[PDB]
RNA sequence: CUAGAGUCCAUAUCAACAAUAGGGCGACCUCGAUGGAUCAGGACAUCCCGAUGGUGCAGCCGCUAUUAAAGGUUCGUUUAACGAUUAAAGUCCUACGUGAUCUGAGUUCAGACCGGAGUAAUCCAGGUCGGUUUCUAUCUACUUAAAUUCCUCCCUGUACGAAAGGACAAGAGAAAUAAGGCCUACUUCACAAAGCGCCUUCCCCCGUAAAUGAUUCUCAACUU
């Protein structure tokens, strides 16, 4: 019975689970784009999202500094988080990361995923795009929108 | 007119029809009068079934 | 040859337009049924002994403590009635049963996730599709025209009702959790036997009796609770305060109807028949309908005699 | 005191006498008035020395005079924690360690 | 709360209940179908080589709301017919014995404190 | 427990060739609009994802070569520049990465 | 069957000598692997609950009989005895019911001691200590709605009874167990699961007791 259990059982235990997530987060901070098993990416996504919120608090805030010290194994990334990532997302209130599914790796056919921070300098990923507005279905619905729009204003 | 059938003698209250549902304590025995009141056509249906050949054609 | 969903080919400028368009239509359809007594209602007959009226479908919100003037505390389940309507009526002869049936639904859901046959059935009815549909056995004089809305005022305080819903599933479980077996001692030489069922039958039969208590799935089945009274009814939010606990998890749909207990028969004499019609009512109901024994929150503190 | 309004002590001569008093008072109580309040059971029927009956606001303890001297009840209901036997008992000591 | 072989504290001033060795008597039988003793139930005590019946007034196990909870299990000794063994009660006792059905007026009369 | 009798090939065929044991046909396969290679609806195209990684790897190789040592993460933004390119008006005070290649068509410049 | 007990009195109950019925030593299969725990299925020759005759049944208790197996039939010390309870702590069948579910002893073993026999080696239906079988499920079979009981009160200290004593039926309250659910509180604990916590729980039982009435409650026609 697992009702309302929002944390996956991964690694060798609760300590190992945190350590595995921490290593993924550190690589995500340093390289700005990493690929990992799909389940591990999804679990780490929440921690990555909350890091910027602590980063927005400012480096002078002692709570954020202690949190950044634990969650960043490499100490050189702490100045980057407080002076690069946080200023970049100061106008953005959420959705700092986007997660996508990639073809399974050939080693063990595992479900693979890629997570990266928005606004990176890396070449853009082939993001899936919705249908263009010029297609037959969109044009017909657009015509319905206009005729409905002209009906209410008159 | 299967409801208005007649039994010779006391077969109405002497003859019984026993069936088992398969569950423990599931043995149920009812008399002809109880069965006829519950199902007017059960008596004729069961009588023919026992006299038909006992093969796949009976169904 | 390939599956599809509603917004697969929609552009960025069309998705919000479609989402609001169906939302506006759903609200318009729901609001068009707020006056059943003016849209050619079916004839209304006076209550008679041995008459069965239609029930309700509600959503389980939660529980709160409730006290009485006697001084005892009773827990009450919050059953909220939302978007409850009568769908279709089947006569006694057509339904080849002893009593006629009535179909009731509730908790309107999206049209994009419904079968084509279900969608067209709701299209002629002029109502958004409901999540669940239940069948209530009624008499001829208790017929209600399809499309008529229903509210929590259909019941009254001091009335005993019955609630049926699917229980909380628990998946595959052992004999100890499923049937409450005593198990085996944890020490004193026991080897891999702490939750095992043990013997299943006797050796002479050489088989296993059908219906034997065995490990397997638990829950996710329909159970009914009887003899639950109504302590309070909220008119504004259409909420029923049924005594005790009811089967099912939170935010689950529960079918409610009058109690079938023999001691509670012939108690619908003063209850609304066939249902409550707020539009045609001469007076406006109070905000909350309490029980005689229920102490109001605003009432002064109880001092016993 | 949060117990009652009136406390009554009655002395008798024989065990039948208190029983006779007990049945007489309850018979009048049930017959005379007060359908609303619940009935009252006789307490101490098997106890020959002591018998009691507790109404809604009045309680009576029918006991022999010898029991009255053994079970002194008058001072306790007039003197709270000032009784001779209550003053006789030792207070809480919380036994200490040895050597 | 109280079951077989459970140590209890005697609160009345009965000479039997006073232990010179500071040894607490333990219950040997609970007079109920399920063998579980809550406030106001009747049990049996094997104290000083004697099998004396007793009445429990308080237990450490939590009960219903607004009901006082004691940090120790308290008992009062009664005769075979209902009369208390001790003369008076010093420790506070619950008032719920009035509502409960049974012979509780004897102990309440000799009780001193209410909680 | 050991088997009592040898299972016949007729029984084994009924079990091994069961319909649920068979591989189900996938109906979520479509051609990539850009490169024309097959891809799943909910999965990124293998051809396009792999070509982005190789460019990312090349840029990251240039990142480390210009970096020249661990624990020296810059505290400024980074912008990659290709051949025949100049810093932009908004590209000031940010680390510049030089790639000895022509900017890809899919790599749109901000 | 009616000798004899039961003051009298076969047949309220008990029962002699007898008679008639029913119940579960042989070597027929196998010499090529008992106790408790848990789960119980079934019979009634009924321990408790229910209905009804008789009584040496005043009433409470009792004894005996008929019918009824839907439901229930406790926890401890020692190795059946008594300790406390209960409406009751039933008799059995089921390969010890059940060891490919588990686990004390015995049928006994490889070591040893005491008592006894034997020249000895070594033995004992005397006692004692210590002491190893395993298994991945192939097949059959199986794997999700009607409740009972105790106590207290009222009737009632009523009927009955000279007193001692002490009920029925109907109704009410409370508790326990069982079945099915739940997390508002308490608690183990915290987006949840669970109980020590809380909520709900609804049919009859045909043994006989009587009217009318022929050759009188009717394997006569008939009524309750
Ligand atoms: Mg579930
Ligand atoms: Mg019998
Ligand atoms: Mg076996
Ligand atoms: Mg349960
Ligand atoms: Zn592609």
Q: Which residues of F are annotated as a binding site?
A: 32, 35, 45, 48
Q: Give CA angle at E31 (E28, E34), nearest 5°.
A: 95
> Can you tell me the distance from the alpha carbon of E75 to that of E10, in angstroms, rounded to the nearest whole number?
5
Quote the number of domains for chain E. Answer: 1
Measured CA E18 to C1' G174 distance, in angstroms: 35
8 A C-beta contact, residue A140 and residue C20? no
Measured CA to C1', what is the nucleotide nearest E63?
G186
Counting one residue from chain A and one from chain F, the pairs whose CB atoms sit within 8 A come to: 67
* Token couple for D21: 């008093």
Tell whether A132 is covered by a domain. Answer: no
Q: What is the whole-number distance in angstroms between the Cα of residue C90 and the centre of ligand 1?
A: 35
Beta-carbon separation of A103 and F42 below 8 A? no
Secondary structure (DSSP) of E44-81: EEEETTEEEEEEEEE-SS--STTS---SS-EEEEB-SS
- C128/C119 Cα distance (integer angstroms): 9
Q: Do E76 and E86 touch, CB atoms closer than 8 A?
A: yes
Query: How many residues are present in chain B?
Result: 59
Contacts of F28 in chain C (CB under 8 A): 2-3
Name D77's Cβ contacts closer than 8 Å, sequence gap at least 6: D7
Nearest nucleotide (CA of D23 to C1') = G157
Q: From CA E105, how far away is CA E85, in angstroms rounded?
A: 14
Expressed as residue numbers, the domain containing E61 is: 1-115
Could you give the CA distance from residue C137 to residue C53 in angstroms, rounded to a whole number? 8
Round to whole Å and give the CA distance between A153 and E49.
Answer: 100
Kindly provide the b/e burial profile for residues C232-249, where b requires at least 16 CB atoms within 10 angstroms of the residue's own CB. Answer: bbbbeebbbbbbeebbbe
Residues forming beta bridges with residue C217, ordered by sequence position: C172
Structure tokens at E46: 């094997």
How would you classify the pairing of strands F78-81 and F95-98?
A: parallel
E strands, F7-103, are: 29-31, 38-40, 78-81, 95-98
Which nucleotide's C1' atom has the smallest distance to the CA of C173?
Answer: G143
Residue F26 backbone phi and psi in degrees, to 5: -90, 130
Nearest to E75 by CA among E24, E4, E114, E19: E24
In three-state secondary structure terms, B31 is: strand
| Cα–Cα distance for residue pair F53/F50, rounded to 1 Å | 5
Closest CA to C134 of C197, C54, C70: C54
Check if the beta carbon of residue A45 is closer than 8 Å to that of residue A39: no
The token pair at B7 is 């039994």
- Partners of C288 in the beta sheet? C234
**Residue whose C-alpha is closest to residue D12's, from D3, D29, D24:** D24
The tokens describing C297, both together, are 């929150």
State how far the Cα of A35 lies from the Cα of A24, in Å rounded to an integer.
Answer: 9
Whether A37 maps to a domain, the answer reads yes
Q: How far apart are the CA of A84 and the nearest CA of chain F, in angstroms?
A: 6
Q: Which residues contact E46 (CB under 8 A, 6 or more apart)?
A: E25, E26, E27, E28
Rounded (10°) angle between helices A62-71 and A14-31: 100
Determine whether the interchain pair F28/C1 forms a contact, defined as Cβ–Cβ distance below 8 Å. Answer: no
Q: What is the CATH number of the domain that holds A41?
A: 3.90.1030.10
Q: Which residues pair with C110 in a beta bridge?
A: none
- What's phi and psi for E21, nearest 5 deg? -95, 5
DSSP assignment string, chain D: --S-SEEEEEE-SSHHHHHHHHHHHHHHHHHHS-SSSPP---B-SS-SSEEEEE-SSEEEEEE-HHHHHHS--HHHHHSSS--HHHHHS------PPP-
The protein residue nearest nucleotide G181, judged by CA to C1', is C247
**What is the per-residue DSSP string for C161-213?**
EEEEEEPPP-EEE-HHHHH------SSSS--S-SS-----S-TTT-S--TT--
Q: Spell out the long-range contacts of B9-15 with Cβ–Cβ below 8 A and sequence spacing 24 or more.
A: B12/B36
Q: Residue C11: which residues within 8 A CB-CB, separation 6 or more?
A: A130, A131, A132, A133, A135, A138
Nearest Cα neighbor of D88 from D99, D97, D78, D76 is D76
Nearest to F36 by CA among F49, F52, F44, F47: F47
- Please tell me the number of the ligand nearest to residue C169's CA: 1
Q: Do chains E and B touch (3 or more CB pairs under 8 A)?
A: no
Provide the sign of the torsion angle of the four alpha carbons A71, A73, A79, A80, taken in this order: negative
CA C146 to chain centre: 19
Chain C interface includes A141 (CB < 8 A): yes
What six digits make up the tokens of C201?
């039958």
Contact C63/C75 with Cβ under 8 angstroms? Answer: yes
Q: Which of F66, F59, F101 is nearest to F83 (CA)?
A: F101
Nearest to C288, CA basis, from C242, C235, C210: C235
Experimental technique for the deposited model: cryo-EM
What strand order describes the sheet that includes E9-10?
Answer: E9-10, E74-77, E50-58, E42-47, E26-30
Resolution of the experimentally solved model in angstroms = 3.0
- C-alpha to C-alpha distance for A93 and B58, rounded to whole angstroms: 77
Beta bridge partners of D20: none
> Is the preceding omega at residue C274 within 30 degrees of 0, hence cis?
yes
E90 Cβ contact list (under 8 Å, min separation 6): D86, D89, E11, E13, E112, E113
Let me know if residue A75 belongs to a domain: yes
Structure tokens at F55: 């460019």
| Å between A33 CA and nearest CA of chain F | 9
> Among A95, A91, A61, which residue's Cα sits nearest to residue A78?
A61
Burial track B6-41 (b if 16+ CB lie within 10 A, e otherwise): eeeeeeeeeeeeeeeeeeeeeeeeeebeebbeeeee
| Separation of alpha carbons C180 and C203, rounded Å | 24
- Token pair 């390289």 is at which residue? A31
Sign of CA dihedral D45, D47, D51, D56: negative
Given phi > 0 = left and psi -120 to 50 = alpha, else beta, which region is C246?
Answer: beta
- CA dihedral defined by C170, C175, C181, C185, rounded to 10 degrees? -110
Token duo for residue F30: 């479509």
Number of Cβ atoms within 10 Å of the Cβ of A43: 19
Q: Are E30 and E43 in contact (CB under 8 A)?
A: yes
Q: Among C1, C2, C7, C9, pick the best mutation site for testing chain F contact (most F Cβ within 10 A).
A: C2
Contacts of C210 in chain B (CB under 8 A): 22-23
Per the DSSP assignment, residues forming a β-bridge with A134 are none
**Residue A102, both tokens:** 């990639």
Calculate how far, in angstroms, residue C175's C-alpha sits from the geometric centre of ligand 3. Answer: 20
| Other CB atoms within 10 Å distance of the CB of residue D58 | 14
Report the sign of the C-alpha dihedral through residues C119, C125, C130, C132, in that order: negative
H and E: helices and strands count for chain F: 2, 4
F14 in a domain, yes or no? no
Q: Among candidates C263, C255, C225, C232, which has minimal Cα distance to C54?
A: C255
- Give C24: exposed, middle or buried? Use CB within 10 Å, 0-12, 13-18, 19+: exposed
Using an 8 Å CB-CB cutoff, list residues of chain A that contact chain F. Answer: 30-31, 33, 74-77, 79-80, 83-84, 88, 100-103, 114, 121-126, 128
Alpha-helix residue ranges (DSSP H) falling in chain C: 15-31, 116-125, 175-179
- Measured CA to CA, the distance from residue C121 to residue C105 in angstroms comes to 13
CA distance F28 to chain C (A): 7
Q: What is the C-alpha to C-alpha distance for residues F104 and F85, in angstroms, rounded to an integer?
A: 13
> Is A145 within the bounds of a domain?
no
Per 3-state DSSP, chain F is made up of helix, strand and coil in percentages (nearest 5) of 25, 15, 60
**Phi, psi torsion values for A73, nearest 5 degrees:** -65, -40
Give the other-Cβ count within 10 Å of A131's Cβ.
Answer: 15
Instruction: Collect all residues with Cβ–Cβ distance below 8 Å to F9 and sequence separation of at least 6.
Output: none
Whole-angstrom CA distances from B39 to B2, B30, B34, C17 are 10, 12, 8, 62
| Nearest by CB: F52 against A30, A77, A126 | A126
d(CA A69, CA F72): 16
Whether the CB-CB separation of A88 and A119 falls below 8 Å is answered with yes
D90 belongs to a structural domain: no
Residues in CB range of B33: below 8 A, 6 or more apart: B12, B13
Domain containing residue A70? 10-120
Q: How far is the CA of F50 from the centre of ligand 5 (A)?
A: 9
* Residues C38, C48 contacting (CB under 8 angstroms): no
Helix (H), strand (E) at residue A136: helix A136-153
Q: Taking the CB of residue F38, how many other CB atoms lie within 10 A of it? A: 12
Q: Residue F50 and residue F56: Cα distance in Å, rounded?
A: 10
CA C199, C1' G139: Å apart? 21
Q: Domain range for residue F67?
A: 27-108
Instruction: Search chain C and give the residue with CA nearest A143.
Output: C14
- Give the number of whichever ligand sits closest to the CA of residue C178: 4
How far, CA to CA in Å, does A29 sit from each of A95, B48, C76?
16, 85, 51
CA-nearest of F110, F109, F30 to C2 is F30
Cβ(E95)–Cβ(E73) below 8 Å: no
Range of the domain at D7: 1-84
User: Which among C253, C200, C291 is positioned nearest to C55, based on CA atoms?
Assistant: C253
Q: Counting every residue, how long is chain F?
A: 110
Domain count, chain A: 1
Residues 6+ apart with CB under 8 A from A133: A139, A142, C11, C12, C13, C14
User: For residue C63, which of C265, C300, C242, C253 has the smallest C-alpha distance?
Assistant: C242
Q: Per the CB < 8 Å rule, is E82 touching D44?
A: yes
How far apart, in whole angstroms, are the C-alpha atoms of residue E74 and residue E56?
Answer: 6
Residue F95 falls within a domain, yes or no?
yes
Q: Distance between alpha carbon C298 and the CA centroid of its chain, in Å?
A: 30
Q: In this structure, are strands D58-63 and D6-11 parallel, antiparallel, or unpaired?
A: parallel
Are the beta carbons of F16 and F7 closer than 8 angstroms?
no
Q: For F45-51, which contacts have Cβ atoms below 8 Å and span 24 or more sequence positions?
A: F45/A126, F46/A103, F48/A126, F48/F106, F49/A102, F49/A103, F49/A114, F49/A125, F49/A126
Angle, in degrees to the nearest 10, between helices A38-56 and A14-31: 70
Cα B42-B44-B45 angle, rounded to 5 deg: 60
Closest residue of F to A83, CA-based?
A: F75
Domain count for chain D: 1
């Amino acid at each position: 019975i697992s009702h309302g259990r929002v944390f996956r059982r991964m690694g060798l235990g609760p300590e190992s689970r945190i350590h595995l997530l921490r290593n993924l987060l550190t690589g995500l901070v340093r390289h700005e784009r990493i690929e990992a098993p799909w389940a591990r990416v999804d679990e780490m996504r929440g921690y990555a999202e909350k890091l910027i919120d602590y980063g927005k608090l400012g480096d002078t805030n002692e709570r954020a500094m202690r949190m950044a010290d634990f969650w960043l194994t490499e100490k050189d990334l702490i100045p980057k988080l407080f002076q690069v990532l946080a200023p970049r997302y100061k106008d953005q209130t959420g959705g700092y990361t986007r997660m996508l599914q990639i073809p399974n790796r050939s080693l063990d056919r595992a479900k693979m995923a890629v997570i990266e921070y928005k606004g990176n300098c890396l070449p853009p990923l082939p993001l899936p795009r919705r249908d263009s507005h010029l297609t037959l279905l969109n044009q017909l619905l657009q015509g319905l929108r206009q005729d409905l729009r002209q009906s209410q204003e008159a | 007119n299967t409801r208005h059938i007649a039994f010779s003698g006391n077969k109405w209250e002497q003859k019984v029809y026993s069936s088992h549902t398969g569950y423990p304590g599931g043995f149920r025995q009812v008399t002809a009068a109880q069965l006829h009141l519950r199902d007017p056509v059960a008596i004729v249906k069961l009588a023919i079934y026992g006299m038909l050949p006992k093969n796949l054609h009976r169904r | 040859k390939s599956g599809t969903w509603w917004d697969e080919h929609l552009s960025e400028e069309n998705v919000p337009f479609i989402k609001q368009l169906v939302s506006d239509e759903d609200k318009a359809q729901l609001a068009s049924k707020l006056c059943p007594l003016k849209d050619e209602p079916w004839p209304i007959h006076p209550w008679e002994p041995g008459s069965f009226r239609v029930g309700l479908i509600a959503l389980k919100l939660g529980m709160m403590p409730l006290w009485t003037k006697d001084g005892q505390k009773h827990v009450v389940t919050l059953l909220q009635v939302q978007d409850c309507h009568v769908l279709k009526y089947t006569s006694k002869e057509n339904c080849n049963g002893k009593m006629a049936t009535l179909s009731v639904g509730g908790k309107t859901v999206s049209r994009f996730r419904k079968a084509t046959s279900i969608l067209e059935f709701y299209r002629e009815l002029g109502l958004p599709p409901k999540q669940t549909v239940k069948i209530f056995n009624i008499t001829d004089n208790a017929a209600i025209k399809p499309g008529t809305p229903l509210y929590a005022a259909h019941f009254r305080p001091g009335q005993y009702v019955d609630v049926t819903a699917k229980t909380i599933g628990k998946g595959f479980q052992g004999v100890m959790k499923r049937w409450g077996f005593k198990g085996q001692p944890a020490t004193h030489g026991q080897t891999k036997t702490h939750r095992r069922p043990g013997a299943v039958a006797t050796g002479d039969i050489g088989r296993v009796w059908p219906g034997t208590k065995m490990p397997g799935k638990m829950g996710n089945i329909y159970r009914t609770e009887y003899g639950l009274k109504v302590w309070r009814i909220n008119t504004k939010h259409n909420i029923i305060y049924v005594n005790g606990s009811v089967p099912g998890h939170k935010n689950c749909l529960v079918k409610v109807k009058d109690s079938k207990l023999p001691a509670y028969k012939d108690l619908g004499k003063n209850l609304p028949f066939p249902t409550y019609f707020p539009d045609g009512d001469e007076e406006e109901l109070p905000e909350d309908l309490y029980d005689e024994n229920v102490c109001q929150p605003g009432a002064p503190s109880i001092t016993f005699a | 005191m949060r117990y009652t309004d009136y406390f009554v002590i009655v002395s008798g001569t024989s065990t039948r006498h208190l029983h006779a008093m007990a049945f007489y008072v309850v018979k009048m109580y049930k017959h005379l008035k007060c359908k609303r309040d619940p009935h009252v059971k006789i307490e101490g029927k098997d106890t020959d020395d002591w018998l009691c009956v507790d109404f809604g606001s009045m309680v009576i303890h029918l006991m022999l005079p010898e029991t009255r001297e053994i079970y002194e009840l008058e001072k306790l209901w007039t003197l709270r924690s000032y009784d001779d036997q209550l003053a006789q008992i030792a207070p809480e000591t919380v036994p200490e360690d040895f050597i | 709360a109280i079951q077989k072989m459970t140590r209890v504290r005697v609160v009345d001033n009965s000479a039997l209940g006073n232990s010179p060795y500071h040894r607490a008597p333990r219950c040997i039988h609970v007079y109920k179908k399920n063998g579980v003793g809550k406030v106001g139930d009747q049990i049996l005590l094997a104290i000083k080589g004697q099998k004396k019946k007793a009445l429990i007034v308080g237990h450490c196990m939590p009960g219903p709301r607004m009901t006082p909870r004691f940090d120790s299990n308290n008992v009062v000794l009664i005769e075979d017919n209902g009369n208390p063994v001790g003369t008076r009660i010093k420790t506070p006792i619950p008032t719920s014995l009035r509502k409960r059905e049974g012979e509780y007026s004897k102990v309440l009369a000799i009780a001193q404190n209410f909680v | 427990a050991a088997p009592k009798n040898r299972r016949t090939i007729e029984v084994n065929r009924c079990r091994r060739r069961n319909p649920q044991k068979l591989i189900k046909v996938k109906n979520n396969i479509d051609v990539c609009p850009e490169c024309g290679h097959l891809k799943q609806k909910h999965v990124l195209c293998a051809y396009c994802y792999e070509k982005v990684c190789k460019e990312t790897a090349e840029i990251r190789r240039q990142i480390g070569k210009q970096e020249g040592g661990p624990f020296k993460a810059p505290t400024i933004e980074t912008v990659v520049l290709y051949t025949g390119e100049t810093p932009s008006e908004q590209d000031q005070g940010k680390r510049i990465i030089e790639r000895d290649r022509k900017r890809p068509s899919w790599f749109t410049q901000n």
